[PDB]
């Protein structure tokens, strides 16, 4: 390197320059004693919101305050305190006579977007990285517990999915499987982080395949292959048909949680899984309304 453009160059600097840093903060900030002020040139109240930053005025600048020692804890607003609570994420029905799953087996694609209460919580951020904990509660349509043997198999993507109650894929020589009774307490296991990326993403702005994107290939927009973790399969262990109808409910609880890049929370009703679609005719405001702005 001889020319004095390469020596002085900043190309190749891989270190991130951070303007800010994190500080310990176990409790809320205290309030100190302040008195009256009568001066020119110091205006804590006057701000400029066009800059794009929040107001830096404090309690002591605007009014006269007293000394208060704040010991309120901030430990309930962390991510593990907010997300490590189990919620319903799926439901599987195994009826005797019906059209959905009459043959005694069912397949469920692993997804979180099926129910609104957990979907709205998880869609506050763009990227998320966590471990899981799945609990399976099984019973009859009326809630009664009956003697029966069940099998749950986890099928990673690419593995052959069972096609019948007596399929050869139920030998589970490689895939993990669980044998449990309906008289036992609900089964629960642990799940790692399996994404090929560094974090799950709930919003993907793009197409997964190359080539022209026509109108008959529009169902591929927004589909991220890195979130497709496989299939959950269930059957009644036997050769003949079972005697009772069954219902299975799945609850999942996160742990070891990290999150990035917050975004506005959902405003309208949900319509489809993995789709931000909303009802065009009925758009409702975020909150309530009143008759006049000058009254209550």
């Amino acid at each position: 390197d001889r020319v004095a453009d390469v020596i002085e160059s900043s190309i190749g600097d891989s270190v991130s320059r951070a303007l800010t840093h994190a500080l310990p903060a176990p409790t809320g900030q205290d309030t100190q004693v302040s008195s009256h002020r009568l001066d020119t040139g110091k205006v804590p109240a006057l701000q400029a919101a066009e800059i794009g930053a929040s107001s830096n005025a404090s309690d002591e600048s605007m009014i006269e305050t007293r000394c208060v020692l704040n010991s309120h804890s901030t430990a309930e607003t962390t991510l593990d305190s907010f997300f490590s609570r189990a919620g319903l994420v799926g439901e599987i029905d195994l009826p005797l006579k019906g059209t959905t799953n009459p043959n005694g087996y069912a397949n469920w694609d692993i997804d979180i977007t099926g129910y609104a209460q957990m979907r709205r919580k998880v869609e506050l951020f763009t990227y998320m990285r966590f471990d899981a904990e799945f609990t399976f509660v099984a019973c009859t349509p009326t809630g009664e517990v009956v003697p029966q043997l069940l099998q749950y198999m986890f099928v990673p993507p690419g593995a052959p999915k069972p096609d019948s109650r007596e399929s050869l894929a139920w030998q589970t020589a490689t895939n993990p499987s669980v044998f449990v009774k309906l008289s036992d307490p609900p089964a629960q296991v642990s799940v790692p982080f399996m994404s090929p990326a560094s974090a799950y993403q709930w919003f993907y702005d793009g197409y997964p395949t190359f080539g022209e994107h026509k109108q008959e290939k529009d169902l591929e927009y927004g589909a991220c292959p890195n979130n497709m973790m496989g299939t959950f399969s269930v059957r009644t262990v036997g050769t003949s048909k079972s005697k009772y109808p069954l219902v299975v409910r799945i609850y999942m609880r996160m742990k070891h949680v990290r999150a990035w890049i917050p975004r506005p929370m959902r405003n309208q009703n949900y319509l489809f899984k993995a789709n931000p679609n909303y009802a065009g005719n009925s758009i409702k405001p975020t909150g309530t309304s009143r008759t006049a702005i000058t009254t209550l």
Binding site: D13, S14, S16, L19, D205, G206, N267, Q268, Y278, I283
Partner: protein, 245 residues
């Protein structure tokens, strides 16, 4: 001091005399990928001055009844100059950005704009109006190109989320009373070290008039809005043929 500014990168320069400081998104500057983060083995190319310079896309007119517009990045620059040629010759892409929005008027005009950057801005549909039809937006709406696209329901941001919470994203205001420009610097935002520039869009730029434009009859009625941007710390890898689609 904070009102006058100059931005110099490459062979282009921007001068302004009415500014409101520079926002550095998420408190981080653009930088190159480190050896620990990198996964591909081939060495990337860094053309430097030929791709990191200011580009101007188009001019849009502000009316008394405007809704808003949005652009997709880096979809705007995939057809412009050496950056476009490099992006459509290689497979992998990474870079930061610097965004400058300009809009000027007189001392008798009034108005306000919100300029925000939202990563992974997915667009939804009105679902036929009743929520019964599972439709998807056409390719024109998802990636409009360098001409942008106009919002239909700015209150829900065309995606079902409120606009009143868009300030959580890196943003500025253009108040015709105070300033006439907005500058935002964005690092590379993704869950992967490299990605395709023809299949993935990193973020989107939103310009929505919160307070409507007004003026008395006799003043100039044409109030244009112009967008200028410049890549920062661009990297390419995976050389092959040139594909456009």
């Amino acid at each position: 001091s904070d009102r006058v500014a100059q931005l110099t990168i490459g062979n282009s320069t921007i001068t302004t005399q009415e500014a409101a400081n520079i926002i550095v998104g998420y408190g981080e500057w653009p930088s190159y990928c480190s050896d620990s983060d990198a996964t591909a083995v081939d060495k990337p190319t860094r053309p430097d001055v030929s791709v990191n310079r200011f580009y101007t896309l188009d001019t849009k007119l502000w009316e008394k009844s405007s809704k808003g517009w949005y652009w997709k990045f880096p979809d705007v620059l995939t057809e412009t100059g050496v950056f476009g040629q490099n992006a459509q010759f290689h497979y992998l892409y990474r870079s930061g950005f610097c965004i400058h929005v300009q809009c000027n008027a007189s001392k008798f005009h009034q108005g306000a704009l919100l300029v925000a950057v939202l990563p992974e801005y997915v667009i939804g549909t009105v679902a036929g109006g009743t929520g019964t039809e599972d439709s998807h937006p056409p390719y024109k709406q998802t990636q409009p190109g360098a001409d942008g696209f106009e919002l239909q329901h700015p209150y829900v941001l065309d995606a079902g989320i409120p606009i009143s919470q868009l300030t959580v994203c890196p943003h500025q205001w253009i108040n015709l009373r105070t300033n006439n420009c907005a500058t935002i610097i964005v690092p590379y935002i993704n869950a992967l070290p490299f990605d395709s520039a023809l299949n993935h869009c990193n973020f989107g730029l939103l310009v929505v008039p919160i307070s409507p434009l007004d003026y008395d009859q006799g003043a100039t009625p044409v109030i244009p809005i112009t967008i200028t941007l410049a890549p920062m710390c661009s990297e390419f890898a995976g050389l092959r043929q040139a594909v456009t689609q």
